[PDB]
From a paper:
The mtEXO complex is composed of two subunits: the nucleotide triphosphate (NTP)-dependent RNA helicase Suv3 and the 3′-to-5′ exoribonuclease Dss13. To understand the structure and mechanism of the yeast mitochondrial RNA degradosome, we present crystal structures of Dss1 nuclease and the mtEXO complex of the yeast Candida glabrata (Cg). Our structural analysis revealed the architecture of the Cg-mtEXO complex, in which the helicase motor feeds the 3′ end of the RNA into the catalytic channel of Dss1 for efficient and processive degradation.
We obtained crystals for Dss170–900 D477N in complex with Suv343–685 in the presence of a dsRNA substrate with a 3′ 8 nt overhang (annealed 20Tx and 12Bx oligonucleotides) and ATP/Mg2+. The structures of Cg-Dss1 alone and in the Cg-mtEXO complex are very similar (RMSD of 0.77 Å over 533 C-α atoms); therefore, Dss1 does not change its conformation upon interactions with Suv3. In the Cg-mtEXO structure, Suv3 is positioned close to the small accessory domains of Dss1: β-barrel, HTH, WH, and S1 which decorate the catalytic RNB domain and form a funnel around the entry to the RNA-binding channel. It is rotated by ~90° around a hinge between residues 172 and 185 and interacts with a cleft between the WH and HTH domains and RNB domain of Cg-Dss1.
Residue numbers in the entry:
A (entry chain A): 90 to 156, 190 to 254, 257 to 273, 275 to 415, 421 to 432, 434 to 449, 452 to 463, 467 to 478, ...
B (entry chain B): 49 to 130, 147 to 172, 185 to 225, 228 to 260, 272 to 359, 363 to 393, 397 to 444, 452 to 468, ...
Amino acid sequence: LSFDPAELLRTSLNVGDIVLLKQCTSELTMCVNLPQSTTDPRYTFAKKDGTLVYAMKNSVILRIPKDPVLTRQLIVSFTLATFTKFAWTQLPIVLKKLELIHRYLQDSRGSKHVNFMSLVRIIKNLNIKEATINGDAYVRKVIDESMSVNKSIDPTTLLATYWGVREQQQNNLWGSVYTNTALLSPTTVAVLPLKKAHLFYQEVITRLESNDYQEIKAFAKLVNDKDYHSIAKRYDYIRTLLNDYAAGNIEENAVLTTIISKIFRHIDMYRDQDVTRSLCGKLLVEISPQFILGNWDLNIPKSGISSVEQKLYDTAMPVSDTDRYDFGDMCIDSEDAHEINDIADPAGLFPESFDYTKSGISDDVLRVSLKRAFTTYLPDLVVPMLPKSFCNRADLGDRKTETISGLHVDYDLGIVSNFPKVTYDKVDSIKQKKQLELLHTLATKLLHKRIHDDNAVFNKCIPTFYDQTKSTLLVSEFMILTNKLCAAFFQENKIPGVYRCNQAKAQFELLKEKDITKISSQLSSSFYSPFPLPHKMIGNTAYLTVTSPMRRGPDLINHLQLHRFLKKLPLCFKQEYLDQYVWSFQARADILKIFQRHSSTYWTLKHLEQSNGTVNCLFPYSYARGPRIGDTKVESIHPLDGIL
Amino acid sequence: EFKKNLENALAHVYSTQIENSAPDQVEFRKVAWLRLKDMLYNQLLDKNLPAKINGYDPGLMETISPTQPQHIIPHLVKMNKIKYEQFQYLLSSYYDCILNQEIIPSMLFSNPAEWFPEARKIRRHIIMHVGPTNSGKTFRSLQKLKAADYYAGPLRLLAREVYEKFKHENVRCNLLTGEEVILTSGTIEMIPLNQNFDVVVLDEIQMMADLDRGWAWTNALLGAKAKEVHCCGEASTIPLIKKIVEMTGDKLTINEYERMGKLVVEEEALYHSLKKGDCVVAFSKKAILDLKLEIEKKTELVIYGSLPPETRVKQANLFNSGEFDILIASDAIGMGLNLSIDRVVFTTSMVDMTSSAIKQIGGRAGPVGYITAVKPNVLKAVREAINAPIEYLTSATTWPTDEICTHVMTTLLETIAADIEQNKLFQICDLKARMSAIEIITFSDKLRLSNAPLKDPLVKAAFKKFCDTIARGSYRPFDILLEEYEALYNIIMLFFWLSNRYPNFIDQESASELKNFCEMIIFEKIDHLKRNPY
RNA sequence: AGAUAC
């Protein structure tokens, strides 16, 4: 009655998969059918009652690997009812356990994410009687023993845990549950600080309901009398509340929303108007001087932990092995580019690179860097994965530069110093140049090879909009090549690494041979893995990313593995930690993807404001989405809400 | 260094000063303090063996974020950054972390409008069409409802009536009842509370104060995600709705309607003076109904609540023709069928009838209607009830939705309804029938079915067989060529309830034919009714 | 929603 999580990595959505759907969140369902046409790519699921449910793939909340609409099929009835009854029965105890370890895993300074599967593991492995003698150590012993490994998970506990977290989400004990789209499984969940989120909101609710919502009525009076100073000093907890709403931090607690409805309802100018995130924002500007950034999941500092860590990054300063190759007397980026990696050796800046004395990750900047799985790049702002000092030092830019740096492919720490001033545009434009021409032609040969031999292979305080060159063909092709070759080196040397991985199907393949919209609801997505898998978009070979060590954590880890290995030391990471780290990376990449698309939608729509039963549409404007699918004035637009 | 000792002194003192601020659970801070000091003393005292082993190790980032306070002192010693300020600050931070760890261990449903946050999150408008029966109150709202792009009725018959009228106007309106599925028209109990429409109509809104049925009207009123919510009913509903609209912030526009036609109570009635167009009202006391109708038939020249709908319609048409002259009704005449009744005759007045019920029955003679009693004492009691002012309802009855009491699970409702009581203008259901059905695995459906209908045990045995048929995850019932036919009809209908709820009971169309067989036979049995079970 | 640069 347990299953291995690796088969999620090893499999895609399939018949027999047991899932929870967003429509039918309160009951388990079973995948009974695949997408039926190019025209309609939705899935079919059967409930325990035998009723069908049709849903888009992204509606899957969690997934269990297997272990024409004939009404007669007990098979499903039996699986779903059995696991559901058991989870349901297991649940109240799970709620108590969740409350308790929330008390222990939570950090008062701020929001802190956890591998969700790990959480499930913890919930399974804890006995309440023992959890009360030699307690606190028993628990942290059950948390380390959580990590210890087999790796298998009970489905029932998984479901019960999910339900438990949502119910306690109503109390602001946990944050939103994030589900990875590739594996269609939950990756991570944030744990909100008890003092700041539970007690604070609870106090606010009592304060606001007190004396028949006296504080609310009095406030709406103040807003109506426009004496905002008193609001400022006396009622800043309400500004806090509206802000927390705007960030999408408390969007799911119904009570804070009814409370806020009463607040808006009592204020004259906004009276009788829709309760939206946008409205809380507009309302806030009308009261504060000079909102997506407020999101707790967006690890922005403004957040006490992100502020502590950024205080570390501000305050930080970094034995180069003579065993390094000298490249002697031998980079297409934007003008406004921050780190130039094209490969830099940030791993060298860490003691872990050479110190096999201490197991695991011991260094503070390294540990923080790994928590931020990537550099965070947004049109609004940038949060570099590495501190500024270290990026300034390690960036490759006439400078002594420490480094790691038909057709046939010849399978069989550095220093560099001559650096030419160049840009993507500059590269596109026109002896060294001849070398470059040879390179572009070579790149075209690489792409042609990948295409014909490997069966290899969407654009567009002041918002601006824009919409692939020879230069881009060049860089992308050589990056893909480098990463494949290093995949091969790691595999051949048996080095554990973080890897990157009907009529409708025929129509898709034909379309493969404009209107990529129709192909788009049949998409595969990337996922990180502790074991090698082909990246079937790029080719038929394993794919291991080493090209971006300063903005991607997995590359950085790959760099540490190379450093230890090349100097014939024991490797930094055994496969098991590789897996853990990989899970955290996937979580933070997904999270970033979500908030990136959120921010782009917000700004696009805000520009618009400044200027298959689905009723989905698109603009020419890529991120403005609101019978003949794929074929080619609205009422309302509220960007913060994502409403169009 | 004794200097450092003095530093720890003034530092800890400074911490006391920063631990004398608020009384709002200052005790936690106190305990944090004692644990602090104790941890220091213990540190140096136990250090007797690891004094230097302590004093060997420096710090880094933990100095800005006091990670592990399992050992403070050695770090304070070996501190070297590039003055006392470092000391006081660092220890203050440490204390804060101790408060993170110590203000954490072992230290520890009357707003139903809140149950519909999505509805509370939008402007909702209430239009109250208030008045007597026979006032035109329903038509303005129904016409507003058509031009839109849902109707909630109390009865399958009224839902049918609106369906029929809409179909005759060329407009595809589906039907959704407990038993029948064809804009949308339904019973109030079948209303979806998650489909953001544009207009909802709630008829007979005063049935919100039914002790047994009233939750659906309250729930629909509070929870319907509609731009306009039109409520039609009597004026006895107005103050609560204002109080209700007070809790939603929703604008309330009231529209008042008077009787379209006059009505009067006669002096004294003369049973031979019963007359064509007389309706003799016997309540659900079908034994009384049956006996009276057979007697009055046996001289010169029937609708009750437990009759099937088709039979009732046939009875109305027959009555509207001179193949039928008088009619006996029940309080089931209070609503439904559109009937041409000249004169109401009350058979009787075991509790007394409410003033409201008398008014509701009497207003169906709608332009001069007449009312009287069989017995003079009742005649005057009726004149009193009839002339009694608009009694106002004090409260609105409520029931937890599926979602909420599933959340409560986390006979539990004994407790839920008790704490619901333990707000002030909200009622708890009776649910005595529901608890009865609860006398009887899935839990969710057990709730979902605890609202299924039956009598007070043939209905109970059929229900058992149904629960058993649920546990395995339809015939035992023969008639060919009276109390038995009414019971069988109710079981075939119950079957229709589950089939409309669980298309995985299959009989369907063929079972519809079976229903008509119970109906014709009951009809013919009632027309030819030569005796009657009293 | 895939890929490189950031």
